[PDB]
Design a protein around this ligand. Structure first.
Ligand SMILES: [Cl-]
Length: 129
C-alpha cells in the first residue's frame, strides 16, 4: 500500500503519533516520505546484513525478526513482515518503542537529515484532521 500524504497523516493521528514524545504529526509524515515514499512494502538491506522494513523503515538488527539477521534482537516482538502490512498499526506501535529509546527520532537518519529543523508542519497542511 502506497499511502496518500493526508491518508497517512490521518492514520498516524488515529494511532496517536501526533506529538508523541513531543514530535508533532508532521515529523512522522516527513519521516515516512523520505524513508519509504509512503510505501508499506518498502525494504532496504543495509551493510551489517540487517534489513529496513516498511513505511518507517524499521531495522531488523534490533526491532523485528526476519530470520536472517544473526545475533540481532526483536524488541518489538514481531516478524518484520508484519511491518509491511497495509495496516500500519504494527509499524506505529514499534516506532513508539523506538522513539522512546532515548535518542528520539534521530533513530531515523532520513528524518535527521531531511526533516529535522525544517517546516515539518507543511507535510500536514491542507489535510482534514
Ligand atoms: Cl529504525
Amino acid at each position: 500500500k502506497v499511502f496518500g500524504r493526508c491518508e497517512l497523516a490521518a492514520a498516524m493521528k488515529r494511532h496517536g503519533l501526533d506529538n508523541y514524545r513531543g514530535y508533532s504529526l508532521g515529523n512522522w509524515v516527513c519521516a515516512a516520505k523520505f524513508e519509504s515514499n509512503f510505501n508499506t512494502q518498502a525494504t532496504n538491506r543495509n551493510t551489517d546484513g540487517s534489513t529496513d522494513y516498511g513505511i518507517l523503515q524499521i531495522n531488523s538488527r534490533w526491532w523485528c525478526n526476519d530470520g536472517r539477521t544473526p545475533g540481532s534482537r526483536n524488541l518489538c516482538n514481531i516478524p518484520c513482515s508484519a511491518l509491511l502490512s497495509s495496516d500500519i498499526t504494527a509499524s506505529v506501535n514499534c516506532a513508539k518503542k523506538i522513539v522512546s529509546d532515548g535518542n528520539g527520532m534521530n533513530a531515523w537518519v532520513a528524518w535527521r537529515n531531511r526533516c529535522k529543523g525544517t517546516d515539518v508542519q507543511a507535510w500536514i497542511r491542507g489535510c482534514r484532521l
